[PDB]
């Protein structure tokens, strides 16, 4: 089947680096068009990093421009997302989200687990 | 490309390959063929004529 668990989420002070991970699933990460989200306490899920199939094309929320950088890396099925120096606002829920499916059975989309992090 | 293909791509006169985008490698294996007429090469994800 089609699933993803997030990890890397932990709580950090302010300033530092965090790289969040993705475990997937039978999907292509080359394939598979890959959102990763957040939901914030007191507020609602809003998009933060979409990395694109087919060109690795990286789309960000203004909030979010400038200090986040999201990949997918083959041969070991992993979506990673970097934040370097995060605001005390980062404090949330993040989730991996697939909207597109592998090439072939095209599956439903599935939200990710998810790691809370806190920024103090 | 599999090595059975090229050993019957001897007398092959067409040949297609549909990748549905996925890399394809050829590496010096496309000269054994001579015969060939027709070369589709859908969605093979090349990214660069192969020599």
């Known amino acids: 089947q089609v699933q993803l668990v997030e990890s890397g989420g932990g709580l950090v002070q302010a300033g530092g680096s965090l790289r969040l991970s993705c475990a997937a699933s039978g999907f292509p990460v080359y394939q598979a068009w890959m959102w990763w989200y957040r939901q914030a306490p007191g507020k609602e899920r809003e998009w933060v990093a979409?990395?694109?199939?087919?060109?690795?094309?990286?789309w960000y929320a203004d909030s979010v421009k400038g200090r986040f950088t999201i990949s997918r890396d083959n041969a070991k099925n992993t979506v990673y997302l970097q934040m370097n120096s995060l605001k005390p606002e980062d404090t949330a829920v993040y989730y991996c989200?697939?909207?597109?499916?592998?090439?072939?059975?095209?599956?439903?989309?599935?939200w990710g687990q998810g790691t809370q992090v806190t920024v103090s | 490309l599999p090595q059975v293909v090229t050993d019957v791509g001897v007398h092959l006169q067409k040949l297609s390959i549909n990748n549905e985008g996925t890399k394809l490698i050829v590496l010096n294996s496309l000269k054994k063929m001579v015969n060939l007429t027709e070369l589709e090469l859908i969605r093979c994800d090349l990214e660069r004529i192969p020599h």
């Open positions: 989200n697939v909207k597109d499916t592998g090439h072939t059975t095209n599956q439903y989309d599935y």
């Open positions: 979409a990395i694109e199939s087919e060109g690795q094309y990286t």
